[PDB]
Chains A and B, each alone.
Chain A
Amino acid sequence: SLFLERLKRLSLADFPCTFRGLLYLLADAVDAQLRHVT
Chain B
Amino acid sequence: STGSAAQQVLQEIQQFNSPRYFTRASVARVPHSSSLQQKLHLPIGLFIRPLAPIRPGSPTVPSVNFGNCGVVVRCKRCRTYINPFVHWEAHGRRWSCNLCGYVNDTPQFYMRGLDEKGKREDRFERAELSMGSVEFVAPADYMIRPPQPPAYLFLIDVSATAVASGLVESACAGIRAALTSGKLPGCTDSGAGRGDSRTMVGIVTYDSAVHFYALGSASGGGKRRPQVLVMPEIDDVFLPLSDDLFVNFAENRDAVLEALDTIPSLWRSNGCIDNCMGSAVKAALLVMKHVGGKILLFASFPPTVGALVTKRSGGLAGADGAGTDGGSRQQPDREVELLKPASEAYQQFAQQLTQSQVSVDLFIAPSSCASPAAGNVPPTGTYAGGKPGSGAPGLVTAPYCDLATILPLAELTGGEVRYYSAFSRLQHSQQLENDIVHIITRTTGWEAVMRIRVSRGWKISARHGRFFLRGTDLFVLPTVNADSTFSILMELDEQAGAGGPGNALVTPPSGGDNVVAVQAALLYTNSDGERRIRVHTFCMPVSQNIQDIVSSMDPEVVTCLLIQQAIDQSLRSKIADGRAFLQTSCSQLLSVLHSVGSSTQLAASYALPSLPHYGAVAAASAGNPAGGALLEAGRLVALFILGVLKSNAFRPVKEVSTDKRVFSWSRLLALPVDRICAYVHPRMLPLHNLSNFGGPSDRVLDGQEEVILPPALRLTAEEMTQDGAYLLENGEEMLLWIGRSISPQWLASVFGAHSLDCVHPDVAAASIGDSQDPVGLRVRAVVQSVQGEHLCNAMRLLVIRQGDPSEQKFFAQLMEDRVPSLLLTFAEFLQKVDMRS
Contacts and interface: CB of A to CB of B under 8 A. Distances in A.
Interface of A: 2, 5-6, 9-11, 13-14
Interface residues of B, number: 11
Nearest to B771: A2
Provide the main secondary structure of the chain A interface. Answer: loop
Nearest to A36: B269
B166 interface: yes
A11 B426 contact: yes
10 contacts: A6-B766, A9-B425, A9-B766, A10-B425, A10-B763, A13-B164, A13-B369, A14-B424, A14-B425, A14-B426
A9 B762 CA distance: 11
Contacts of A10: 425-426, 763
A5 B425 CA distance: 13
A2 B425 contact: no
Contacts of A6: 763, 766
Contacts of B770: 2
A6 B765 CA distance: 11
A13 B766 contact: no
B429 interface: yes
Count chain A CB atoms within 10 A of each CB in B164, B424, B425, B770 and give the residue with the most.
B425
Contacts of B425: 9-11, 14
Contacts of A13: 164, 369, 424
Contacts, number: 22
A9 B429 contact: yes
Contacts of B166: 11
A9 B428 CA distance: 11
A14 B762 contact: yes
A33 B827 CA distance: 73
A21 B424 CA distance: 19
Nearest to A14: B426
Contacts of B763: 6, 10
Contacts of B369: 13
Contacts of B429: 9
Contacts of A9: 425-426, 429, 766
Interface in B147-190: 164, 166
A27 B384 CA distance: 39
A9 B770 CA distance: 15
A6 B764 CA distance: 11
A34 B763 CA distance: 37
A10 B763 CA distance: 9
Contacts of B762: 14
Contacts of A14: 424-426, 762
Contacts of A11: 166, 424-426
A19 B426 CA distance: 17
A11 B425 CA distance: 7
A13 B762 CA distance: 12
A5 B766 CA distance: 9
A31 B512 CA distance: 91
Nearest to A11: B425
A2 to B, nearest CB: 6
A6 B752 CA distance: 14
Q: Which 3 A-B pairs have the closest CB atoms?
A: A11-B425, A14-B426, A13-B369
Nearest to B169: A11
Nearest to A5: B766
Interface in B427-465: 429
A11 B426 CA distance: 7
Contacts of B766: 5-6, 9
A10 B170 CA distance: 12
Interface in B741-771: 762-763, 766, 770
A16 to B, nearest CB: 10
Contacts of A2: 770
Interface string B634-673: 0000000000000000000000000000000000000000
A13 B429 CA distance: 15
B793 to A, nearest CB: 17
Interface in B701-730: none
A14 B425 CA distance: 9
B774 to A, nearest CB: 17
Nearest to B426: A14
A35 B527 CA distance: 55
Nearest to A2: B770
A13 B166 CA distance: 10
A28 B340 CA distance: 49
B780 to A, nearest CB: 13
A21 B724 CA distance: 39
A12 to B, nearest CB: 10
B400 to A, nearest CB: 22
Contacts of B424: 11, 13-14
A5 B429 CA distance: 13
Contacts of B164: 13
